[PDB]
Symmetry: C3
Subunit: 336 residues, 3 copies
């Protein structure tokens, strides 16, 4: 497309919402290619990541860890206005794994506090893709400070199975998984700091052990439980988008399955089926499609169970509906 052709395309301004929720969108594209406009303000802020009051100096796209999910369709243009307020201390940028050129956009979006930038890229490939900050010489530090999210580039005709049959979800959730490395004292108590830079040297030491102190969904242990448990009903079709910008994960829906899983996150790669546990490498997003068949509480985990149940990588689903005794029944309840 020429500069003139792009200029003539319709514009749509999207309002982003906080994960695990996803902004309003259509699965099948409405009309032809558009320039889809997003704005995110970067917030450097303290976050509390466990019930012991452990703190991380988060570097958060749109004020959240993970950053929000941006949804476009194949061959749309994604136009991001990225803002780094004067209240921040560090330079930031953005690398879209979905984008082609200039280190995913990182080379064109380096903004100091008090600066903003506008990047436009063509979403040529359908799938879920990681995005993250990557300042030269400071890359993993920003990423493991929570400065990452994902986008979804839907096929223009929506999702399909390996045989070309349409797959249409009722609900979509975005689970961003984060590896944290909290510094040791000598007593084994987590250290607190009053500036992000003050934590750098100590954090780098922990990072280099390749052993996270916490592995969490949505920025904290138990984040996606209770008041933030995800919800569904029996018969409901749900897409779970899962990202990890720095480290491998292995999602599993306890009590369920991944009926269709784009484990690589790319929609032109046929999905795996009937999955118990899928695998998403560090630096990637994946997506799982499931139709709920049983009511009750589900746990959604990274199935290294130490990571899930000692380090924090566990979410819940609360599912309504009728129990199916054909699928599962207690013939004899626990008894003497």
């Amino acid at each position: 497309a020429t500069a003139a052709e792009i200029a003539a395309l319709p514009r749509q301004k999207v309002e982003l919402v906080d994960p695990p929720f996803v902004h309003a969108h259509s699965q099948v594209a409405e009309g032809g290619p558009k320039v889809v406009e997003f704005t995110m303000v970067i917030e450097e802020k303290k976050i509390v990541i466990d019930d012991a009051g452990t703190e991380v100096h988060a570097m958060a796209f749109n004020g959240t860890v993970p950053g929000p999910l941006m949804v476009v369709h194949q061959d749309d243009y994604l136009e991001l206005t990225l803002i780094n307020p004067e209240t921040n201390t560090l330079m930031h940028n953005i690398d879209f794994h979905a984008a082609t050129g200039a280190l995913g956009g990182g080379g064109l979006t380096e903004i100091n506090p008090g600066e903003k930038t506008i990047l436009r890229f063509k979403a040529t490939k359908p799938g879920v893709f990681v995005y993250h900050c990557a300042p030269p010489g400071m890359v993993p530090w920003h990423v493991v400070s929570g400065m990452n999210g994902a986008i979804m580039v839907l096929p223009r005709e929506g999702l399909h199975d390996g045989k070309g049959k349409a797959l249409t979800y009722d609900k979509i959730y975005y689970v961003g998984e984060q590896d944290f490395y909290v510094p040791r004292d000598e007593n084994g108590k987590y250290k607190k700091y009053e500036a992000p830079g003050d934590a750098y040297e100590d954090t780098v030491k922990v990072m280099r052990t390749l052993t996270p102190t916490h592995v969490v969904f949505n920025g904290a242990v138990g984040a996606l439980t209770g008041d933030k448990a995800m919800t569904a009903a029996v018969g409901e079709k749900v897409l779970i988008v899962h990202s990890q910008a720095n480290r491998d994960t292995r999602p599993h829906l306890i009590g369920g399955h991944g009926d269709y899983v784009w484990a690589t996150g790319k929609f032109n790669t046929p999905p795996d089926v009937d999955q118990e546990t899928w695998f998403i490498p560090g630096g990637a997003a994946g997506a799982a499609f499931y139709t709920f068949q049983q009511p009750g509480i589900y746990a959604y985990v990274n199935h290294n169970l130490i990571e899930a149940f000692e380090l924090g990588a566990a979410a819940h689903f609360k599912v309504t509906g009728e129990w199916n005794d054909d699928l599962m029944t207690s013939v004899l309840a626990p008894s003497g």
Copy 2:
């Protein structure tokens, strides 16, 4: 199916066998859907996991690590009687990754010492699947104490490749891989404990390092070697089912390949072919089909070679038959330059 219809189905009681062997089963389903009945008694037991005499307080389905492989066909029902004897100290349950609902059955099978339960589920999806204990608040401790195994849900028409051609194995082995996290004293020597509970706090510390002290097949370093080495012959078709309930593995047959590998373990997902090293994520089972072409000793390993040869993740095959010089030959044996 209605309650009346399920009640009308044939019942078949199966006697389980110890890994790496698999009970008789057829491969192609014989007749219509059935309710296949299994019984397992849970044993909390001391096991020795290396030649030094390192002990683990194992929590063992059917008294073995891994628990035994249960084999059914798609749309059969698996009906498990699970028994927690009064001689045990902990509550246990079971999560079948193959099952749908109540945390894989875990929510319906919480049994205290002196209790039993019977769970029935419909095996709706074909493949190999992990099962493991998962008591709320104590999940990884039970799993990494060896309380896990796998099942196989065969398609009713047996196995096929990605293109609809039948794949019929001559024999099957189940390799359960276990990460252990054994506490050490100040001398760096593995600690021994009187009671399972005495080891909890020390073990959780090691678990949090995400670095196992031992990574083993069939419950111990060298368990599948010597007179316990797996066996095959040139021309023999072998299915190797491999599970890891907690941690990633990367199986490799040294001297061989995986001709067809269901790396995700699910038979409706077409298998990868001609594999050197496959990958099974923690919390899953996979399966590899191979026809042996050369005689001699093979090593079957987790191909992080530190895990294989330092931490214990190596098994052997003994293979009978005629050497094939077309496939491989020593043109010049090691000799002076």
Copy 3:
């Protein structure tokens, strides 16, 4: 084939080239099956792997870490003369993952210093495959001392996509990734040793932590960056072969993609498409095909970004050509 038929096959000697470059070959097979002959001398030598003068006693096929890429076609034979000079102090051998029998050849190629051996095997399966030394009882020590490489067994009709359309590369690079486990003294300084064996006990202790001190491409931090960056042009089709003989990796082309990725490395397994980050398990090789669309500097990394940017697993591509504003443009450059 009969005994006379095998003996009647042409023999061809090939001159090897140091990684990341690859020796002369044709993508489509030229003529019928051949016995392709290679020679490699094993070198035990001290190498410097980082900017701080850190030493490894390398055990190097053909004197390089990784060993060179050998290229044949399906149903060719690979016939390797392996030489262990009397100046070396250890026994070595070779396990070809591409080969069938005798522990990949390891059982037939155990050569003491002052010995040589010739192994022939039929390359029955198409793909990229690891090779490595594997002396019984000291296997990981040799491998993590850099004694590993890869081969490529091309289909006789060259590469194809999942739909059977031909994929012809303009150039090929081989990136061997190495995990090193370098002992440190109590002050955190890396230790030096007189002879390879002197480091054995200390090195195994580090190995058992499963935490490399260094993760590098082409044998050293920054070996494929700066003036040693790999090169391409806009419109050029590049195959990147990547191997890791001992430990998982997750390759990512920053600013690009893997258009077609044989993540398992086997060409009869259909390639994944539109990949952001692919996954190669320890003990395997993979291959990614990409057509460059934007000029400039790219980074090519293991996308555990701590491994990439703290431990050394980062390479560069320098790409020439015209910038494509349709694919990506800075609408507003960083500004107040």
